[PDB]
Structure formats: C-alpha cells, structure tokens
Amino acid sequence: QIGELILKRLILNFRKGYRRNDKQLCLTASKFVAHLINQNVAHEVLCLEMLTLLLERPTDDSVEVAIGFLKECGLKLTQVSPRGINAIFERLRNILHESEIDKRVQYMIEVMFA
Amino acid sequence: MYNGIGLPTPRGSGTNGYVQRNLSLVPDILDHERKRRVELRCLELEEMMEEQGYEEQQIQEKVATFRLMLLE
C-alpha cells in the first residue's frame, strides 16, 4: 500500500509535468517510474502507456523524455515483453524518420539505438 | 606456414620434418625582410589611401611619406 501510494504520487507528478509542460518535474517523475519498473513494482502496461503518450506527438521534449525513461527502463520492458522493445523501435523509426525532426531528435534516436 | 623453413619432402630424410619456432628468439635575411616590410608599407599605404582617394597624387603623397618617414 505504501509503495502503491508512491506509485500513484509519481503518476500524478508525471502527468503534471507532462500535461503542464514542466520538463524537470516530468523528468523526475519518469525517473521514479522507470526505477519502479526496474525494481519490479510498476507494471509493463503503465510504462507502455507512458512511452506511448510521450511518443504520441514526439517533439524534442517528449521524445527526449521517453529517451531518458528508456535509458534506464529499457531492460525491464525488453526482457519481460520484447513486444515493447519492438514497438518502441518501430515507432521511434517512423516518427523520427518521417516527420520534420532535427539533430536534437535525430541524436536522441541515435542514443536510443545505441 | 611453410615460410621458407623445412624440407621439400620429409621422405627419405630420417625425420618427420616437423618444424617449430625458436621459443628463445627474443645577413640579408633582416635587410631583405625590411624591404619586404617596406613593400606593403608602400602598397598598403597607397591602398589605405586608395580607400580614401585614388587621385594617384594624394596616395603618392601618403606613400612618399610612408617611404621616407619609414626609411628614416
């Protein structure tokens, strides 16, 4: 119940940072949520929903937020459900190779591939 | 690697022909350059004079002084 309240609070903080265009708060809450998904306290569907909402309309900011989340939680999602890894890679390739994205999102995708 | 070592054929030689590697194997410069210093001292003066006039007399005046006042 305590870690559950922590998860709810981090979800509130992540949705706040994202919906209010707060880079630092969204990044910190995504850090806590990725740490949860790696500690095996947060499920894969919620991380999928986070990565999808960040990559729904990827800009520099939201794609980079997904990239920071992934730089830590890419092991849990790809080892528990490689479907998440395949979806992440394909969606990244499409939204970063078929939309007017710059060296910023280009190098974020490059870090993702690395 | 038959690196120029060994026999063509170990055949009538009394040996198996096995090879191995030896394990225990281990003064005008300043004056010519003053005339070079003087060189642009005429052109670049006559050029910077050309920037403020190419009458060929006002630049010859600035170049003549820059040639005499420098050589002094």
Partner: protein
Amino acid sequence: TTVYEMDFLADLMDNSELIRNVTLCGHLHHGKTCFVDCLIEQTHPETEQERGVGIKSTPVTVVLPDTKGKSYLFNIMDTPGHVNFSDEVTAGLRISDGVVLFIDAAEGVMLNTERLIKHAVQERLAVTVCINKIDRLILELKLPPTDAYYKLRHIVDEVNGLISMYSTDENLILSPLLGNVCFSSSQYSICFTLGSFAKIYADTFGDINYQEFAKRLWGDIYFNPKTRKFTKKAPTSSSQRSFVEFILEPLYKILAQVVGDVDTSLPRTLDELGIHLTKEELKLNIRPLLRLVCKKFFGEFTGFVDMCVQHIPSPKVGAKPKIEHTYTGGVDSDLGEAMSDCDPDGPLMCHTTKMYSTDDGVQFHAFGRVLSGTIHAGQPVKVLGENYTLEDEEDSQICTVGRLWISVARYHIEVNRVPAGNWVLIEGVDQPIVKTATITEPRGNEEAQIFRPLKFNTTSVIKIAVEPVNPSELPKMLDGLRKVNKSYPSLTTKVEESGEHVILGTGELYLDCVMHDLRKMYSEIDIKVADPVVTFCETVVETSSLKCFAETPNKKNKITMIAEPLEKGLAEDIENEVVQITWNRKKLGEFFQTKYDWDLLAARSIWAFGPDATGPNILVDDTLPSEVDKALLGSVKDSIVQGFQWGTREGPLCDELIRNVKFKILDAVVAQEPLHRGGGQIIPTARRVVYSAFLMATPRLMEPYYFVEVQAPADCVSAVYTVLARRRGHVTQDAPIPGSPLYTIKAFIPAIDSFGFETDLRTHTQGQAFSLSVFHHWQIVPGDPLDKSIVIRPLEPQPAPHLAREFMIKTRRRKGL
C-alpha cells in the same frame, strides 16, 4: 588453338535519337554482370570466370523495347567494381552519357558507390539508381514489409545527401516518383519502377490511369479504402503507406507463396495473378521456379529501359554540355559546334579509349565513340596522339580501317559503316596509339584538336621492378610491357635510369593481374619481379632560416630564394583545380586574400605552380626594389619557372616529387643584358637555388596512406583491431549497418604496411571480414631523413625514429646512388 534485323539496327544507329549511352557502375559484386547476362538472354535466346571478379569492362549494345513498344538501341558499359580497377570506370565515364549506379539493398552505400557518384557528378553525366538484390530483404534478412520500406527509404536518402554534397546545384533529387530508381533482383527476374508497376496494375485490372497512380505510391501517402482516395497522414487505422500495401506486401506474398507453400496454395495464387504454368514447369526447384514466376508476371525489363530513356541525354541532345570537359577548346569556331551537331557528316571527330586485345595476335581493336561524322571500312583516317598539339603534327600517324565491329558481350558482329553517336571496335588503329586517341579525317584536314586524355580518380602508387631471367630476351619483355601499357588505362610503366623497368600500379590485385597477362599472353619469357614498394614525396616543416644563392657558370646572374611550408588546404585546392591560375592575377588575388588572408602582394608575387600544370608547390617573387627590374625579371621568368618545375619534379632527396612547399625569391641580381649566357645557363642555377633552400633548412619525407573499409560480423571486430595495430593502423570509425547483422569499420593504414593486409584479415577471421583499400593522402613519415648517427640493421624492421632514414637509404641505393 541478324539478316532483316542488323539493317534495322543500322537505321536505329542512323536515327541518333533512339539510342542511349549508359555506364553500368556501382560497388563490387552488387549485381552488374548478372544484370547484363539475364538481359542478353532476354534479347538473344540464342581469368574472370575463375576469378568471380570482373577485371576489365565489357561493352554491349542491344535493342530493347520500352513500356510502349518503341525499340531503342542501348549502349551499356558493364564495368568492374573493384576499387582497385576504378581505371576502367573512368574510361566508360568519358565515352558514355549516363550512369546506372547499382546499389545493394542489403548493404547500402559503401566505398566504391560513393566514390563513383563523385566521379560521375564531377564529369557531368546523368545519374540513375537501381536498388538491386531486393530478395535479400525478403528471403534472407526476413524483414517485415514496413521495415523493408524503411531500409529502401534510407538508402535513397543517403545517396541523395552525398550527391548533394559533391554537387552544388539542387537540379535533381532522386526518388522513384521522378523515375530515377529501379527496384531489382537480377537473378529473380524482377526490375520495376513505380511507373512500370502501376502500369502492370492497370493492364491486368481495370482501366485506372497508370501515370497519376504512379505519382502516388512512394513516400508516406496513405490510402483509405472507403473514399478510394489517397491521403497524406489521416488514417488512424494504423495502416501502412501506399508503397507497402500496394507494392511490397503483394511482393512478399508472391515470394512467400512460391517458397513456402509451393505444393498447396501456389496453383490458387497463380490463378489469381493470371499466370498459367505447366505441370512440367511446376516441377522445377525453388530458385528456378521463383525466377520463372517472377518473369512471367513482371514482364521482361521495362522498369530499367523506362527510367533510362526518360532520363538519358540522348547523344543528340547529348554532346553539348560534354565538350566543355572533353574537348580542349570546347566550342570556338569549327569543331566544337560541328561535334555538338552530332551529325553523321564531315568532321569525323572520334575518341578512342580502350584496346581489347584479340586472343590470337598482338593487335588490338581500338574502341571508341564517333561524335561527329561517319566511319566506314577502309576509310583513311589520321590519329591524334596524346602529346599532339596543333603545331606538332609528327605525333599524328596516318592509317586506315581494316574491319568494323559492333559488340554484344563477347560476340563481334562486323559491319561496313557506323554513324556518329555509337561505339565501335575499329581494327587497324592499334599500332599508332596508346591509352587515348582522337581520330580525325585522313587527307581531309580542316584543323583538329584533341580531347584532354583521361583523368583518373585514384593515384597509382604501388611500385614493382621487373627484369628477365636471362637478359638475352630483354627486347621480348619490352614488347610485352608496351602491350600491357596499351590494355590498362592507368598502368604507368617507366624504365628508370638505374636501368630497371618499374611498373606503377594501383593495388596488389591489380599488379597481380598485370603480371598475369604479362607472363600468360604478351610475352612467354620467364620474369623476375621484385617486392612491392611505394613511391614517396619530399616536403619541409619550417622555413629556410638562411639561404644559399646560386650564380651562373659565367658569373652573371645571382639567384636568392628560400623555401617554407604551405598549408594543406591551398595545396589540395591546387590539386582540385579550384585555384586554377588560368585566371588573371586579379582572380588569383581575390581567391588568396579572401580565403586564407594571403597578401595581395603575395598574390602579385606568385609566379607559377611547379611540377606541372597541377603542382602543389608555389613560386613567389618578393623583392620590391629590384622588383621594378621587369626589363630583366620579366625576361628571366621563363627560365626561372622552368628551373622551378624541373627542381620540383626531379626531387632533391631521392628523385621523387615534392609537395606542399612555397619558394620565395628575395634577391635577383640579374646580369645587365641577360643574353644567351644567362638564358641558357640559369635554369640549373634556378633548380640549385631550390635544392639549396630545401636541403638547407628542413628536409622531411612523405609517404601515402590507404583508406580501408572492413565489413565484419559483430564479434570479429576486435580481430581486425589487432591486425591494424600490427601495421600502424589508427582505426577511425566503427558503426552498425542499419538493417543488417554487420558492422563497418573505417581505418587508415600506411600503404607500406598494406601488403597482404586483406588476406591477413580474412585468414585470421575465417573469411568473415573483407576490406578494400584506396589511396587517400600523404603524410609525414616519423623519421629524420638526414641523420648520419642513424645506422640500419640491414634486415630486421626499423623502429619509427628511422623509417625515413631507411626509406631513403634503400631507395637511393637502387636509384640515387
């Protein structure tokens, strides 16, 4: 050891607006020769083979129908793709008008592909692409159809970025909508453009307009079934692009049905496509079956001929933007324009670039393009050699024509006459000519120029000494050498004054094939051959702090000059023809001052460029008070520059070329009335001034480098690393290949240590890795060339501090004495 159709061929030649001259280029093994072979079998149902590598090019001219039925005559120059044989490509690149670059779908762009797009844009040809070998994405790599789309898009965008990099003008971007690219599988009988595929869609199904359709397929257009109207992004269906759903996915299903379900579902699926197939022809194995089905459905070759016809210059349009480069005057009064007419008439200005030796004898068949006029049998013609300028006509030998041939890959079809715009193998013009020839009319002289002889992309840098076993046959060997110098475009042979015959070549495989032909065909002498070494250069690192000034034998004229180093950028510009002094001193000055803050007085002082027209050294004239002695200096500049270029060429240290150095004249005590005494005895004076400064205050040696690109599995990367360490490597880059299980490595390597590096690499890794090499740039060899305190243990390898020392002591010992 074609009755009613060659006449038709002749009339096609005569139209000169139904022919296209194209060069089939690309990287190694990327599909060229199989393309050509399956194509000649489409038309005719009527060293190399053991090598599996093509060494020398072959031309084919054939008659192909398009997507409308109008026959064309096609001039197809099938080249080799080994980076060592780039010579052959240059040859084709002159005598043709467009280029079909074949790229691999599984690898993408590599060394030779980018280098060939460079060579093609700098010669102002047309550029088309065939992304070949597409089955390697379906059967081999097993890619979801959308990621096949991704990979194809990637290859096209990267080749686009490079072709933009070397060419300023955004006149053409490649994308299949414009008809720039085919998609192919040479062996599986499939080649198609959006045009051809949409026309297939129309012809078998309803009457849809194939053109407007083809405008809609590639490139992020989606399609919604209900509206039956293609849209930019607005399916939320999570559907694919027009390309995938309409062109790839049907192709995936075609293949998957053929190879997977040949027994059950194939007859049904074949019905749904309109192909009927015999019982006997459904008992074939999977590769012959697959190719047969794909041929039966995709038709023969329309994608290629369509793309090419649509974007070929057609030599009639043709010639004009070409004679800028080829011709030495281009268009002045008489012949530039006459050729530009491309009329079978009068001038008869032809360019011969190849000589394919007949198996039996010594003679060749010169091979070339007839720009203007019309050649016939027995036609007496006069050659124009490579040295011939209009006022030295001894170079022009006068001869005739024995036979005339036209070519399919290895079939010679002899004819009586050929009009301008074609290629032809001429018999009889062999003995007079070497690498290049310019043919003009015999006994009918108006006046003629030559086209500047072939320019090559790579510098031939490897050196091999040759001698017979018993000198008695030295003449026979000499015969042999002439002949191979004939058959190889950049083979440069020279008899060195120490009495030897050095051969100068591109790579180890190149020289191997050279000596193969030398011992096999042209002379049957037994020949000794030295070990390979490289040709060097000389340079400096700092200025001549003091000067030794040379004075005439008859002590009349005193020449004071020092040396100092240039910077690399401007020397490379000297090479690239960017700072061509064909300008007036004004353009020279703006160039120099504008870019590298050179002095305008430095510009007024710069006289000439040394070793030749293109010489990376510079001669500078800076002594103002005697500078106004233009009566005497304006007189002596001629001998001054002659001595300059002689000195630069003949080398101060080891008889090799210098580069990257600037010389300055600081005191010219000229003899009053510098008559013939001066004029004659001042050139050695000048070059001794050059040597004096150079040797005086900083000799240094320079050696070439090789660029190496290694494909490798993921694991064996470390392996190649170790190899490059043994050989003074400096691996620069290592990168994934997008969409492949391979990594690409890019590295440098001293051409010295490049000997056997390929085979060493492949042996250590069980064939998995593979490298090609090109000359890239010279560099300072880490030694001190002139130190007597350095003695050389005569057979073990030197450490670096003395490489330069050794390097000279050896080479002079054989040359310089």
